[PDB]
Design a protein around this ligand. Structure first.
Ligand code: AGS
Ligand code: MG
Lengths: 319, 608, 448
């Protein structure tokens, strides 16, 4: 502001810095508006996050964002899986040729390695042929989450954002999928991948990314109830988790109690047990002192032990 | 004699063929000598005696117009009239004061600077702001008088940060309680309304009023009605109470919907009600006055309704049945031509809530005057912008039981904490609504950015609104460059606030706009594109005039009202620094800023 | 030097001290002899002397025939009354219960003196009849006074009124409490001797119980009376907690709150109504938090006054503090008074909204001033005459190191371990709990 008002020439650089900052948060629309007022990584990261697939991508560029963008754009503008495989393979080849070029600092080096990882996950889901392969891909995502909980944040955030783009694009492009993979399967696997990323982002205390993820998940509920999916309880519990982690205790408690009142946790893909919901409500009500400790035990804890139904083993009963 | 002298001297000074003019001048001289020699024991205090002297003497020497310069006759007279207006034992009355003000303020002359102004200190402005606002609520006032009144109101708000209380009241109960004073009955209210017509009407209206008063007082003296006698002896002064007595001699469809929209609903309904009770002498003499005099029916409607309902309490209750059946249709009436009669219906209900029912145990029986559905009345009062009245009606409704209107009430009522007591189902959207009500900073920017991204990516149509919200948020922070970039991607306040903060002085400002940001922007733009201080002063004065005209327009909530008052304060500080002539004046302006800081430390944050 | 520069702030202390206790009495007597010797204060000390003598004589004079509880006697029919009126005419002083601000200019001429006394005085119900005098000042205002005699201790009440005023002054230094004018209403206690005092009769209030007991039968003629509820609760006082709670539920099912009418029948204009109800809620929130932090007890309906000009509540009789109230035979185990009638006056959003937010702002400002509150209580710790327990005399009058423990409790109520939201939630839970309100003493009208 001080440089725009004084007609200073540094404001340009200021804008640059701002765009950089606004990409390290997740606020993609604001950085888009700041770019349209006139970097390369920022331009193509924002275009991929907002899904603007009509940018003319430069050729022979050393940016990882351009490589990943060209792969996803080709995935958008193509009717045959072979064109998309060719674009992914060209991306992998160019990235390795750039890693071999030598003088790279460590941040650029890890960005290129993360581009390789993103292109490999894209190639993996493009090549699924049945349901068992889809479940194996999901289990692979879970093991990698085990590594990701402790890893560096730049690499983790990059890989997870690209994975989100991959899963949504695959769910949208119906002709790129194999025969026996309906849209309900693709939607369900996208939801599960998002919930996994939300766990990971929660451990890193990344507030804006959990907010972004829970908003984008809540926007999928209308187009999930028309495919025949019951995923409102898990998505509303993710929204309650986001609220609780931003400091809104009473809003989170009211949201969880609404889940518990009017929802059928039995007929629900992405399952949700009633005892873990009840014990979550009980814990949050105890932390906020919202009820007397004699009603907490009567309404939330003894109902939870009764919901266990004699089962005294496992992680649910342990919790 | 004070009011008669003021009005007569004013009309003569305007009147001043040759022989008639010399006769008028000789009469003027004789009358001024008489007034200078006048002295009475009936003066309440010596303050009133000095006020009389000053009013008469300054009126004897005024010119055709009025000014605000310090030391002239017109400005001393204006200051005397204003100082007398705000008092408990006032010399003048409404017609004489209106005549004087329409002479002085009809063509005005606002001083260029403010060191030559009759009101130049922050304390004079704080003292006289209420009366100066009360004054600039007429229609016969020039533009320069409205600019001067805006300067005074702006200086008062910049020095105190407090709104004059006439702008904050939303019911008419204060006027009904001023009229029906002494005893507190509707008969005294009607008698005061009729008495005020003798001194303020033309020939015809004063004649109707004198006829009505003669009938009433004579029929109360003969029939020995002690209640009506006690009403008359406290509503009328003794000379009028004696000239109303024929001592030897002898005295010579509405109830249906869609009728709320013609501008004469009140007059027709008042006549229809008053005709149904001939045994009350105070309602029998009304239909003439109600039909002839303009604006009398709206002032007299509650008293008439109460008198009729109280009369036929033990008899067959006809007016109660008719009015309570029609209210079920009148209260559910969303219309622009019907809003001004709906306000009068709500004020009548409120007035009836303050009148004791004969043979009652508690006040909870004053719900039996009419039969009002209090939820409908709450919704109606929310449509008219009366939010405290709406909250009272909502509470009466809740008592009647033992939440879509409560949200609109609590979003707009003027309390910091009340909104948070309302319960509404939880989600990220509702938390965002509470954060944007609360005017939070980065905390609403987070949730709004998430919504906005999710709506741009999904090609949703709500993103537009999201952008709007974001711009609003980004102006409540101070991040002006970001909101500028968000605006260039395609509000009015946001556009011109951002343009003023970044100093972009080439926007084409709309003309005749109700936005404070546009007014302030046009003043500063003119300050940029001008080579003479006179053009800038003219633009500032046009801004003050337009802002006062917008404050007088009526239906404004409290946030818009305080925004307009802050625009007045900004234009006044601009005018103050434009008029400095040396270094001592610069240091005095800086010291003024410091004292206002003393007030500002505790004031509301939006205004500050 | 304090008594010479500001005589209306030191000379009553000197008078009380003169008229290790023997050494204190001797020193104050020497200071009094010296005060009646210098030129600045020589027409002020004799006035206070004679006037306090006649005020004390009037306080001590109890005659069941000449002073009937509830009547309104002209104060000329006793010899004490005529001596009082003569002495008060001959010696002009400011009303002893008027709060005088301290003057930096050292000029106390602008202070209203007592012009005359209203001819009559009211009398309240008791053994030692507390008489309510009225004094018409020079500026033409009426200052009423309780002339309280007996064996009470007004120095406890005066010390605690001073402590509460100091903490409420602390509240003015923060943006959120100052924006809302959160504070308490003060009055003036003036102990004359160890058995008598003058209490300022707060101008245009009404006791909460004197409004609530007639209103309950005016608005609900089919409900129980207040005396019937009190008796039903007192009969089940020597029974197990289950029977007490059952009787309490049975009694409050036939007793409905009526406090919301206090505002509908003193303020019929909706603007005034809304402002006065907000004043009520805010002053209740401030005194609730402040009296939790300082252990304030004895909060029954005769210690709470409703100001029917501004809508706010006034708390008087502030002597049972620092948790002295949970040591009584039937303990007071609530943090503050939040019965159904107190909450009924707060509106349609009962405790949510203004009350809970103002409780949180008050408590947040208080635990950010814990050092200043520690300083105030430490100044209290070096007061030889302040008792940190409740002597069995007043303990029997109430229900038909001690400094270190009390100050440590106060210090741990101001600890930032929990959040303000959670603390206020717990307080409002235990203040409105039916299992806590059912075992309170019957004179603490919890059903109301
Ligand atoms: N300073 C005061 N200003 C106004 N009213 C007061 C004041 N002090 C007491 N009252 C009221 O005046 C009456 C006198 O009561 P007191 O005799 O002082 O004691 P009490 O509380 O009535 O009786 P108990 O036995 O102590 S419950 C009561 O209704 C009090 O509420
Ligand atoms: Mg008491």
């Amino acid at each position: 502001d001080s440089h725009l008002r004084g007609r200073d020439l540094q404001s340009r650089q200021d804008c640059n810095a701002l765009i950089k900052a606004l990409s390290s948060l997740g606020l993609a629309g604001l950085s888009n508006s700041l770019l349209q007022s006139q970097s390369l990584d920022a331009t193509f990261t924002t275009a991929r996050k907002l899904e603007i697939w009509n940018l003319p991508a430069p050729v022979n560029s050393d940016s990882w964002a351009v490589t990943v963008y060209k792969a996803y754009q080709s995935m958008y503008q193509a009717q045959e899986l072979d064109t998309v495989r060719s674009m992914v393979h060209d991306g992998l080849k160019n990235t390795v040729r750039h890693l071999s070029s030598g003088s790279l600092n460590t941040s650029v080096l890890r960005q290129q390695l993360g581009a390789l990882a993103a292109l490999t996950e894209l190639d993996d889901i493009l090549n699924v042929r049945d349901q068992s392969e889809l479940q194996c891909t999901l289990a692979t995502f879970e093991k990698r989450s085990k590594w990701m909980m402790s890893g560096r944040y730049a690499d983790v955030s990059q890989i997870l954002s690209c994975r989100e783009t991959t899963l949504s694009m695959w769910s949208q492009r119906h002709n790129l999928r194999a025969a026996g993979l309906t849209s309900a399967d693709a939607r369900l696997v996208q939801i599960r991948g998002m919930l996994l990323s939300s766990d990971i982002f929660r451990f890193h205390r990344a507030r804006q990314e959990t907010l972004n993820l829970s908003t984008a998940l809540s926007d999928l509920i209308p187009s999930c109830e028309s495919l025949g999916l019951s995923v409102d309880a898990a998505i509303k519990m993710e929204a309650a988790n986001a609220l609780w982690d931003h400091g809104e205790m009473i809003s989170s408690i009211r949201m969880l109690q609404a889940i518990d009142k009017d929802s059928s946790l039995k007929k629900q893909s992405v399952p949700l047990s009633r005892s873990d919901l009840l014990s979550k409500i009980g814990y949050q009500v105890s932390v906020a002192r919202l009820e007397s400790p004699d009603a907490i035990q009567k309404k939330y804890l003894e109902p939870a032990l009764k919901e266990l139904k004699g089962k005294i083993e496992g992680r649910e009963a342990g919790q | 004699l004070a009011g008669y002298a003021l009005s007569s001297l004013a009309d003569l000074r305007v009147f001043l063929f040759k022989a008639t003019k010399s006769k008028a001048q000789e009469f003027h001289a004789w009358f001024s000598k008489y007034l200078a020699a006048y002295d009475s024991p009936e003066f309440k205090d010596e303050g009133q005696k000095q006020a009389f002297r000053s009013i008469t003497e300054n009126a004897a020497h005024i010119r055709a117009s009025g000014n605000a310069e310090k030391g002239t006759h017109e400005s001393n007279l204006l200051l005397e009239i204003l100082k007398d207006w705000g008092r408990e034992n006032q010399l003048l009355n409404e017609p004489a004061r209106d005549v004087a003000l329409s002479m002085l303020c009809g063509v005005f002359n606002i001083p260029p600077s403010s060191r030559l102004d009759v009101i130049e200190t922050d304390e004079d402005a704080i003292k006289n702001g209420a009366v100066v606002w009360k004054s600039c609520s007429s229609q016969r006032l020039g533009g320069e008088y409205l600019a001067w009144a805006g300067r005074v109101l702006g200086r008062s708000f910049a020095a105190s940060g407090e709104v004059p209380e006439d702008l904050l009241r939303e019911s008419q109960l204060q006027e009904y309680r001023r009229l029906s004073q002494g005893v507190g009955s509707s008969e005294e209210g009607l008698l005061n309304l009729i008495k005020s017509l003798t001194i303020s009407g033309d020939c015809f209206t004063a004649g109707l009023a004198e006829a009505a008063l003669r009938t009433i007082v004579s029929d109360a003296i003969s029939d020995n009605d002690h209640d009506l006698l006690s009403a008359c002896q406290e509503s009328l002064p003794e000379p009028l109470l004696i000239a109303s007595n024929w001592d030897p001699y002898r005295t010579p469809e509405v109830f249906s919907a869609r009728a709320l929209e013609n501008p004469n609903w009140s007059q027709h309904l008042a006549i229809r009600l008053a005709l149904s009770a001939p045994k009350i002498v105070t309602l029998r003499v009304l239909p003439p006055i109600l039909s002839k005099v303009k604006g009398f029916a709206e002032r007299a409607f509650p008293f008439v309704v109460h008198l009729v309902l109280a009369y036929q309490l033990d008899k067959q209750q006809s007016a109660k049945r008719e009015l309570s059946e029609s209210l079920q249709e009148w209260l559910n009436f969303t219309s622009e031509p019907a809003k001004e009669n709906l306000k009068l219906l709500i004020n009548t209900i409120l007035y009836l809530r303050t009148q004791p029912l004969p043979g009652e145990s508690s006040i909870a029986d004053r719900a039996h005057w009419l039969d009002v559905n209090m939820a409908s009345a709450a919704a109606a009062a929310t449509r008219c912008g009366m939010y405290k009245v709406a909250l009272l009606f909502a509470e009466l409704a809740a008592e009647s039981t033992r939440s879509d209107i409560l949200l609109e009430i609590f979003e707009n009522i003027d309390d910091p904490d009340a909104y948070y007591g309302l319960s509404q189902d939880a989600s990220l959207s509702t938390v965002l609504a509470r954060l944007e009500y609360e005017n939070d900073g980065a905390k609403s920017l987070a949730f709004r950015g998430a919504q906005y991204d999710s709506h741009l990516r999904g090609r949703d149509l709500q993103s537009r609104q999201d952008c709007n919200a974001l711009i609003k948020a980004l102006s409540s922070l101070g991040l002006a460059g970001l909101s500028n970039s968000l605006l260039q991607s395609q509000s009015l306040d946001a556009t011109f606030t951002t343009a003023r903060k970044l100093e972009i002085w080439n926007l084409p400002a709309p003309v005749n706009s109700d936005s404070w940001a546009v007014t302030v922007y046009k003043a500063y733009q003119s300050m940029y594109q001008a080579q003479e201080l006179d053009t800038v002063r003219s633009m500032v004065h046009d801004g003050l005039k337009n802002t006062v005209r917008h404050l007088s327009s009526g239906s404004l909530n409290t946030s818009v009202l305080r925004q307009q008052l802050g625009a007045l304060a900004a234009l006044t500080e601009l005018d103050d620094i434009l008029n400095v002539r040396d270094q001592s004046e610069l240091q005095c302006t800086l010291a003024t800023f410091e004292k206002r800081s003393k007030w500002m430390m505790s004031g509301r944050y939006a205004d500050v | 030097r304090i008594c010479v520069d500001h005589p209306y702030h030191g000379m009553y202390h000197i008078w009380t001290g003169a008229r290790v206790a023997v050494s204190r009495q001797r020193a104050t007597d020497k200071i009094a002899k010296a005060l009646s010797k210098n030129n600045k204060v020589s027409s002020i000390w004799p006035a206070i002397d004679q006037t306090s003598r006649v005020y004390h004589a009037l306080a001590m004079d109890r005659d069941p025939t000449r002073y009937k509880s509830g009547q309104k006697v002209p104060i000329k029919n006793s010899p004490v009354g005529q001596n009082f009126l003569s002495t008060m005419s001959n010696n002009p002083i400011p009303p002893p219960t008027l709060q005088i601000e301290v003057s930096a200019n050292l000029d106390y001429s602008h202070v209203p003196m007592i012009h005359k006394f209203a001819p009559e005085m009211a009398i309240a119900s008791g053994v030692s009849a507390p008489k309510i005098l009225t004094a018409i000042g020079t500026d033409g205002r009426k200052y009423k006074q309780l002339v309280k005699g007996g064996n009470d201790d007004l120095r406890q009440d005066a010390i605690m009124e001073q402590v509460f005023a100091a903490v409420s002054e602390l509240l003015k230094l923060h943006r959120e409490t100052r924006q809302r004018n959160l504070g308490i209403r003060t009055y003036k206690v003036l102990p004359l001797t160890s058995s008598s005092g003058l209490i300022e009769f707060v101008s245009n209030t009404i006791p909460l119980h004197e409004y609530l007991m007639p209103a309950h039968e005016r608005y609900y003629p089919k409900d129980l009376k207040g005396s019937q509820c009190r008796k039903e609760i007192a009969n089940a006082q020597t029974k197990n907690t289950e029977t007490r709670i059952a009787v309490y539920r049975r009694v409050t099912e036939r007793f409905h709150p009526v406090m919301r009418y206090f505002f509908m029948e003193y303020f019929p204009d909706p603007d005034e109504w809304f402002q006065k109800r907000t004043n009520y809620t805010r002053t209740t929130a401030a005194i609730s938090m402040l009296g939790h932090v300082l252990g304030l007890g004895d909060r029954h309906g005769h210690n709470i006054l409703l100001d029917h000009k501004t809508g706010e509540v006034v708390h008087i009789d502030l002597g049972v503090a620092f948790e002295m109230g949970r040591v009584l035979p039937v303990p007071e185990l609530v943090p503050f008074r939040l019965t159904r009638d107190i909450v009924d006056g707060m509106g349609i959003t009962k405790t949510e909204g203004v009350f809970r937010r103002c409780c949180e702002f008050t408590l947040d400002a208080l635990r950010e001033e814990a050092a200043s509150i520690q300083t105030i209580l430490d100044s209290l710790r070096h007061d030889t005459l302040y008792q940190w327990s409740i002597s069995p005399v007043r303990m029997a009058k109430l229900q038909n190191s001690e400094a270190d423990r009390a100050i440590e409790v106060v210090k741990k109520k101001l600890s930032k371990t929990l959040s303000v939201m959670a603390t206020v939630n717990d307080l409002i839970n235990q203040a409105t709990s039916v299992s806590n309100l059912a075992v309170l003493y019957s004179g603490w009208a919890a059903y109301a």
